[PDB]
């Protein structure tokens, strides 16, 4: 396209002369050097610039379309002076080196592999690899470090440190006393979450994300039992006074299944403050039972009517789509982290399900893998086919990759070096499963797409166990190996109490990690690929497309569809804005169009959860599972919930997104 | 009163048996022991409880009035469960106890005189003294520890922390970059002092003080050369987008002499960012002037007309009667301090002037002198005198208490206790100034008038300076009095170039302080005594009446007059509501009532001033001149700043009140 082209203009050739540029860079209204590489990776260009520039490929740059293209320039791009001075190649050579560092054979392979849109890392990488303050990092996990004015404030300053550059924020706050509770050495009595959530809101307000044009903005993450509960769940209401909501911040739900099940028994439910029911959030399953069950009898706190509860939260999904549902007791049976402790919360999109402290801040880096890649005919005919060993291949190459970003990490805090440094958790995830189906002719809802979802997830996991076993057998398993499921031959299927599908050797695998163990805690969670999937020209995620339009472009497969069966004129042009991005209803389309071409909005949500189910047994942490819903109900959204809770599921929602 | 006899009813009467109640206590509703004195004090009853008991003289609860007794129990007097416990005399004898812990003789001194009402201790004092955690403070004067967000979140949890009990805050922020200043390792600009100012605003509005019903407040400090002056100014406007205002708080002036000679002049004044102008608020007076005509030559500013900014700030005053004025420069040229570094905020009342940096954040313990209570007959005739001799003596007792309130107090941050423990700065004030006059019948503009308030300030300093001498003789100077200027034998006024009125022998304190030392680094501010002087039933600190009415009750001094001149009928009731406090323009009141009994709004300004000119000498710190303006306009109020800006004063002005 032209805007490739004007890019190729505007900008020097030569690798080499770039990180020049950029490394010289000083800012001409300040007087500072304001250097854009890092000494590592400049000393490194400069002592194989020869193999370096001629190993970039610039035809590759027409990789990309144009709304892939224009990301890319209008934030990913280093820029000296307002104008763009990096070209894509550029930008990926030095994530390469970024993550390499002398490795030059890795380096040259992660290049070929990214320039070729195999895969692709996640925009803190992007941004900052190769940089001198290379925070490389998505995600934070953050605890609330006390029940005190000194233990707020302090974490506060954690998580202003932490937005300070790339990455957003998951922090659990079922340790804060609620609304109305007694504070020794005063006459004066608490007021709750709701103010203190107004501080956290503000703070986000302030602190600009590496400078951005974000939206910088945490997830919080409460237990149901808690006393301040109402509110919690109404803090992004539209309506209302100011004064009680937060509209910046995103409120999260941390459910015991013993909340749905006096929902289901139409029971009731009882909530208390923290410094009178202590504990509750350091134990889960049958001790949580057991311990609630006896504050409940003790008359410790208020008791109200379960299903009052519940129908307060399904009000607020259904005007903001929040809170998120993610299910305590699935989270932590089924951790390989469970030996270090009780898991509070998750991340700022549910996928991440690591342990946090006051003194351990979880991390997480993220890449993920372009599905449609690995599709090709190879048989003889036309019958296209999934390569699954180039999967396999693939991914123990971003496993290799995201092992390195942990250790050339900048971190921004110290809890946080701490806490990556001993569990080292990962996290790969995936984009083009809605592309994948639809290139190789499957309905979204096909017994055939089940099937395929399921395979792809047992290599991915199965890769990724592997690579970063011979990771172990290389350096070492992460400190605390010893007393996890994995070091006790106990895989994620098995917590779920499943046979693999066996498409590969678990026996073998199983085998070597209990013998030499593995370098990373954790390894999978699928991850909502906002910008990334934009980039590489990809649906985004696992989910199904949201509409077959979205200056409006239409669907590429159905239009090459459409103009193969010589029915593409100006009546489809029409009919497709008027019923926004939906073929059912059309005349003059085949069905089997239309069944490979069902948007979101008309493939049922049980199918949606079975695959989440389904895939759900290869996942280490968990995934973003946005719901999506035509004509919304209280019954409707009832049995979604219920329905994924039953399925074992550990992210029963991420966003609820409406007609 | 029927007030006070309904206490005497609903309360115990043995001061050991309230003391029991009291200590005894627990939280009925938590089962938490929630004891209302401390060991040592509770201890120190129970080993003197016959002394102590008999000592009590019941009488003197009836030396209140009805809207001073009221403020009492509305929040002085400690509460069991709702109900008030404490009876006036219990809670001036827990203070006396509070204070000199086991010398019983000073105790019984301080309770008679308090109980008397010869003076009292500041708010703090009375709510905390004798009780666990006795934080008797009023005064923080907190530096901005650095220019990053790990320097403003630290400040930010030490305002928080110290929010949490009783006392204000005066905070300087002189070093925080303003808007669109350069930030290192981010494309992102800075966003200056509102949205951080907006930040503390929130934190004052979350964490309430002592648990009270107050607005919580800071203070904040600015040099007008700064850059993001204009939106400084008006925090507190009416108007404008909410995103740009900060209503909880107050914006302050740090004021150099060269800002008021360009005025002046008219002439040009140039506007920096921190990062690019360092040093400016390290440094006073000449040094300054060498510093910032430099810069300003060197066009690292922004230059615009003095005046411009000159009107923005009349502006901002004439509407919300903020920001407040205080000289940079006189406050440091004529510091008892100025051997610790340059001075750079005062506090939220503008009288504390101390030395304050990242890691001493200065305090101040008040307490304030009743000035009528050392009227007297005392001749032969009916003619008063004002006796000098006991003022002296009880001035003396005042230094001694708030010396000894420093060691016995509670530090809400490590930052305090070294500031304290090193410099014991000290903070008298008084209060019935107007009351003095008006018993003495002299209109507050008078010679004699003008007489007795040098007379009174000449003999408050000087007792102090020889009590903390004395104070010096058995303990020992502070520890940074070498170097200081009473170490070099220069007192205030002489700092002022001036030969005290010569009331009392300066000669021999000065050659005592030389040789011994003193042990306080200050002794005198002035403060503006607003709920102690209604307790005590006098006018506020060193102003006059506001109006001569204030469910509506007349001056007392006034009613006694027209009652004996027989003119108080109706007639006088009414015209006294209709010109609301005002006794001019009354055709059947004498001369001598209309003078003695003017009304602020009717002396001048140019008396207000002399009179603080003229007292300033013998304070250490400075005092919170509030300004009054009938019909304002800009000349008006730039003759006012001006005539005390050439007066020496370090406070120019604190509030402005109009119409
Ligand atoms: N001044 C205040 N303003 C608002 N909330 C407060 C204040 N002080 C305490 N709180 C609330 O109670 C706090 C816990 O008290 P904290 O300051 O940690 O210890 P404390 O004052 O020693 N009382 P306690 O924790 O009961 O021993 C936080 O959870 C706040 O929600
Ligand atoms: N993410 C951000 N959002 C808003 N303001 C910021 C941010 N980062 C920095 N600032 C502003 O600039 C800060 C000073 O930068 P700071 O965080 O102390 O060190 P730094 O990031 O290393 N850059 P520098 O101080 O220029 O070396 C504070 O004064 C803020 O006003
Ligand atoms: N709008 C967003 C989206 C995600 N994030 C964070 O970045 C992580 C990356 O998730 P993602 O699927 O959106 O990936 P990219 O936005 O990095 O392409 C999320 O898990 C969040 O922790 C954010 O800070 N702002
Ligand atoms: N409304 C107020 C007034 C003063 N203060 C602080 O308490 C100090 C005491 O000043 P003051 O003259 O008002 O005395 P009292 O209010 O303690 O009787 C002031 O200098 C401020 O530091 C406050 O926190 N809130
Ligand atoms: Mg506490
Ligand atoms: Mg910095």
Same mark, same amino acid.
């Given at each position: 396209?032209?805007?490739?082209?004007?890019?190729?203009?505007?900008?020097?050739?030569?690798?080499?002369?770039?990180?020049?540029?950029?490394?010289?860079?000083?800012?001409?209204?300040?007087?500072?050097?304001?250097?854009?590489?890092?000494?590592?990776?400049?000393?490194?260009?400069?002592?194989?610039?020869?193999?370096?520039?001629?190993?970039?490929?610039?035809?590759?740059?027409?990789?990309?379309?144009?709304?892939?293209?224009?990301?890319?320039?209008?934030?990913?791009?280093?820029?000296?002076?307002?104008?763009?001075?990096?070209?894509?190649?550029?930008?990926?050579?030095?994530?390469?080196?970024?993550?390499?560092?002398?490795?030059?054979?890795?380096?040259?392979?992660? !290049?070929?592999?990214?320039?070729?849109?195999?895969?692709?890392?996640?925009?803190?990488?992007?941004?900052?690899?190769?940089?001198?303050?290379?925070?490389?990092?998505?995600?934070?996990?953050?605890?609330?470090?006390?029940?005190?004015?000194?233990?707020?404030?302090?974490?506060?300053?954690?998580?202003?440190?932490?937005?300070?550059?790339?990455?957003?924020?998951?922090?659990?706050?079922?340790?804060?006393?609620?609304?109305?509770?007694?504070?020794?050495?005063?006459?004066?009595?608490?007021?709750?979450?709701?103010?203190?959530?107004?501080?956290?809101?503000?703070?986000?307000?302030?602190?600009?994300?590496?400078?951005?044009?974000?939206?910088?903005?945490?997830?919080?993450?409460?237990?149901?039992?808690?006393?301040?509960?109402?509110?919690?769940?109404?803090?992004?209401?539209?309506?209302?006074?100011?004064?009680?909501?937060?509209?910046?911040?995103?409120?999260?739900?941390?459910?015991?299944?013993?909340?749905?099940?006096?929902?289901? @028994?139409?029971?009731?439910?009882?909530?208390?403050?923290?410094?009178?029911?202590?504990?509750?959030?350091?134990?889960?399953?049958? @001790?949580?039972?057991?311990?609630? #069950?006896?504050?409940?009898?003790?008359?410790?706190?208020?008791?109200?009517?379960?299903?009052?509860?519940?129908?307060?939260?399904?009000?607020?999904?259904?005007?903001?789509?929040?809170?998120?549902?993610?299910?305590?007791?699935?989270?932590?049976?089924?951790?390989?982290?469970?030996?270090?402790?009780?898991?509070?919360?998750?991340?700022?999109?549910?996928?991440?399900?690591?342990?946090?402290?006051?003194?351990?801040?979880?991390?997480?880096?993220?890449?993920?893998?372009?599905?449609?890649?690995?599709?090709? #005919?190879?048989?003889?005919?036309?019958?296209? #086919?999934?390569?699954?060993?180039?999967?396999?291949?693939?991914?123990?190459?971003?496993?290799?990759?995201?092992?390195?970003?942990?250790?050339?990490?900048?971190?921004?805090? @110290?809890?946080?070096?701490?806490?990556?440094?001993?569990?080292?958790?990962?996290?790969?995830?995936?984009?083009?499963?809605?592309?994948?189906?639809?290139?190789?002719?499957?309905?979204?809802?096909? @017994?055939?797409?089940?099937?395929?979802?399921?395979?792809?997830?047992?290599?991915?996991?199965?890769?990724?166990?592997?690579?970063?076993?011979?990771?172990?057998?290389?350096?070492?398993?992460?400190?605390?190996?010893?007393?996890?499921?994995?070091?006790?031959?106990?895989?994620?299927?098995?917590?779920?109490?499943?046979?693999? !599908?066996?498409?590969?050797?678990?026996?073998?695998?199983?085998?070597?990690?209990?013998?030499?163990?593995?370098?990373?805690?954790?390894?999978?969670?699928?991850?909502?690929?906002?910008?990334?999937?934009?980039?590489?020209?990809?649906?985004?995620?696992?989910?199904?497309?949201?509409?077959?339009?979205?200056?409006?472009?239409?669907?590429?497969?159905?239009?090459?569809?459409?103009?193969?069966?010589?029915?593409?004129?100006?009546?489809?042009?029409?009919?497709?804005?008027?019923?926004?991005?939906?073929?059912?209803?059309?005349?003059?389309?085949?069905?089997?169009?239309?069944?490979?071409?069902? #948007?979101?909005?008309?493939?049922?949500?049980?199918?949606?959860?079975?695959?989440?189910?389904?895939?759900?047994?290869?996942?280490?942490?968990?995934?973003?599972?946005?719901?999506?819903?035509?004509?919304?109900?209280?019954?409707?959204?009832?049995?979604?919930?219920? !329905?994924?809770?039953?399925?074992?599921?550990?992210?029963?929602?991420?966003?609820?997104?409406?007609?």
């Amino acid at each position: 396209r032209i805007a490739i082209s004007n890019l190729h203009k505007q900008t020097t050739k030569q690798f080499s002369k770039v990180v020049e540029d950029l490394y010289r860079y000083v800012n001409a209204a300040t007087g500072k050097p304001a250097p854009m590489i890092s000494d590592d990776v400049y000393n490194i260009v400069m002592e194989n610039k020869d193999k370096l520039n001629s190993a970039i490929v610039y035809d590759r740059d027409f990789q990309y379309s144009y709304f892939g293209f224009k990301t890319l320039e209008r934030s990913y791009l280093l820029r000296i002076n307002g104008q763009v001075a990096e070209r894509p190649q550029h930008l990926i050579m030095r994530v390469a080196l970024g993550i390499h560092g002398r490795d030059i054979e890795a380096a040259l392979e992660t !290049y070929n592999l990214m320039s070729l849109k195999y895969f692709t890392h996640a925009s803190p990488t992007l941004f900052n690899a190769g940089t001198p303050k290379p925070q490389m990092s998505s995600c934070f996990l953050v605890a609330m470090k006390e029940d005190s004015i000194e233990g707020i404030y302090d974490t506060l300053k954690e998580c202003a440190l932490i937005s300070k550059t790339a990455g957003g924020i998951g922090l659990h706050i079922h340790n804060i006393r609620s609304t109305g509770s007694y504070i020794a050495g005063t006459n004066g009595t608490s007021n709750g979450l709701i103010p203190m959530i107004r501080v956290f809101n503000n703070t986000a307000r302030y602190v600009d994300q590496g400078g951005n044009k974000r939206p910088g903005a945490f997830a919080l993450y409460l237990e149901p039992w808690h006393a301040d509960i109402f509110d919690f769940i109404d803090i992004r209401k539209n309506h209302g006074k100011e004064e009680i909501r937060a509209r910046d911040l995103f409120p999260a739900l941390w459910i015991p299944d013993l909340f749905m099940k006096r929902v289901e @028994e139409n029971g009731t439910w009882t909530l208390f403050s923290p410094t009178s029911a202590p504990g509750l959030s350091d134990c889960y399953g049958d @001790e949580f039972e057991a311990l609630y #069950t006896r504050y409940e009898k003790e008359g410790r706190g208020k008791t109200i009517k379960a299903q009052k509860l519940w129908y307060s939260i399904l009000e607020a999904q259904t005007e903001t789509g929040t809170p998120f549902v993610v299910y305590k007791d699935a989270c932590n049976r089924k951790s390989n982290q469970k030996n270090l402790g009780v898991i509070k919360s998750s991340n700022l999109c549910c996928e991440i399900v690591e342990y946090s402290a006051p003194d351990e801040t979880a991390v997480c880096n993220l890449a993920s893998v372009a599905l449609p890649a690995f599709i090709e #005919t190879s048989e003889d005919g036309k019958t296209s #086919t999934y390569n699954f060993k180039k999967l396999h291949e693939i991914a123990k190459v971003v496993t290799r990759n995201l092992n390195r970003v942990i250790d050339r990490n900048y971190y921004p805090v @110290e809890e946080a070096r701490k806490s990556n440094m001993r569990h080292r958790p990962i996290a790969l995830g995936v984009q083009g499963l809605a592309d994948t189906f639809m290139l190789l002719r499957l309905p979204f809802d096909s @017994e055939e797409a089940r099937l395929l979802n399921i395979q792809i997830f047992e290599t991915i996991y199965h890769a990724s166990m592997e690579a970063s076993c011979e990771l172990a057998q290389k350096d070492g398993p992460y400190e605390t190996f010893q007393g996890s499921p994995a070091s006790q031959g106990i895989l994620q299927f098995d917590m779920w109490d499943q046979k693999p !599908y066996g498409m590969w050797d678990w026996d073998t695998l199983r085998k070597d990690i209990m013998k030499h163990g593995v370098r990373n805690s954790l390894t999978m969670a699928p991850m909502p690929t906002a910008s990334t999937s934009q980039i590489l020209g990809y649906n985004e995620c696992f989910e199904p497309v949201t509409s077959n339009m979205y200056f409006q472009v239409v669907n590429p497969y159905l239009l090459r569809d459409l103009v193969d069966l010589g029915i593409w004129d100006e009546g489809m042009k029409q009919y497709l804005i008027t019923q926004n991005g939906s073929i059912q209803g059309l005349p003059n389309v085949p069905q089997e169009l239309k069944d490979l071409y069902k #948007t979101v909005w008309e493939i049922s949500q049980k199918t949606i959860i079975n695959m989440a189910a389904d895939r759900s047994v290869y996942i280490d942490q968990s995934h973003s599972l946005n719901l999506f819903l035509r004509a919304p109900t209280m019954g409707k959204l009832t049995s979604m919930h219920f !329905y994924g809770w039953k399925k074992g599921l550990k992210t029963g929602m991420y966003y609820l997104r409406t007609q």
